[PDB]
Design a protein around this ligand. Sequence first.
Ligand SMILES: [Ca+2]
Ligand SMILES: [Ca+2]
Ligand SMILES: [Cl-]
Ligand code: NA
Length: 317
Amino acid sequence: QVLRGTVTDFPGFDERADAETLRKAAKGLGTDEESILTLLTSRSNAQRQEISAAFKTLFGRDLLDDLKSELTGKFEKLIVALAKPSRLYDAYELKHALKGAGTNEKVLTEIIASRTPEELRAIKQVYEEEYGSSLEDDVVGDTSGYYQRALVVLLQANRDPDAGIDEAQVEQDAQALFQAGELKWGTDEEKFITIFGTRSVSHLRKVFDKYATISGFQIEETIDRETSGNLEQLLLAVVKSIRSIPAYLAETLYYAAKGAGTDDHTLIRVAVSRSEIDLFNIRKEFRKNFATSLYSAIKGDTSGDYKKALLLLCGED
Ligand SMILES: [Ca+2]
Ligand SMILES: [Ca+2]
Ligand SMILES: [Cl-]
Ligand code: NA
């Protein structure tokens, strides 16, 4: 609906003034992080880029390079994440999930399953113009099996638009998933992909509906029992993403800070990735689901300048 984040444009923005506020608390053996923190988090990504631009035209240095040398810990990755082009961040951490490590598919799934069709083309055409290699090829180059198949299916944003809704297909697909799923001595996860990947959101969101009536089980739990791991993560991702991306991502955070396993990585990207998209929506229904404030969590799970930075990014809920 009306997706709104938290990070808005700073009143009477002064790119040159801020540009050298970072020159200062990046100075000598004084790395003043609370300065950078409050400022960097008080102005939209859009502007902190013309601050990065007014930085090297001013002092001839890379605001990124310099920053990422002076700060350490989760605070470093938080600020770097914060200071980079929005229309180049999703593609960024995608390259940092197909690199010298070669795992971190939790990033692949959560980015490719959550980004709407329109912005997939962005994240993917920009990737090959900044890195040179096909976004699809890099996925197909690491990911294998049905997962990589689904990823490719989702990676080319071709999902049918919201043209209408005909119960005819709704019941048609439902059973197609039903047979591919439950009614079989196996899994034709190829009816799954095409059903989760190609058909529209509206269609699918009501397909998931009557599947519950048809099967007694809801599309998601039938997945858990009919699929395993990574592939399951993707459909699981797509499914709940489809009924509500802010919800999916909202719980993407709960699971990121639960039991002695703070995945600062997800808490970082998920927070910055949509700091100005729908993070407001994220924390407002994070209360109706997880009965907790996203604010209570970040302060009661992390420390350092990290938490107060996250809090100011989180918003004011
Ligand atoms: Ca310094
Ligand atoms: Ca089966
Ligand atoms: Cl890079
Ligand atoms: Na950003």
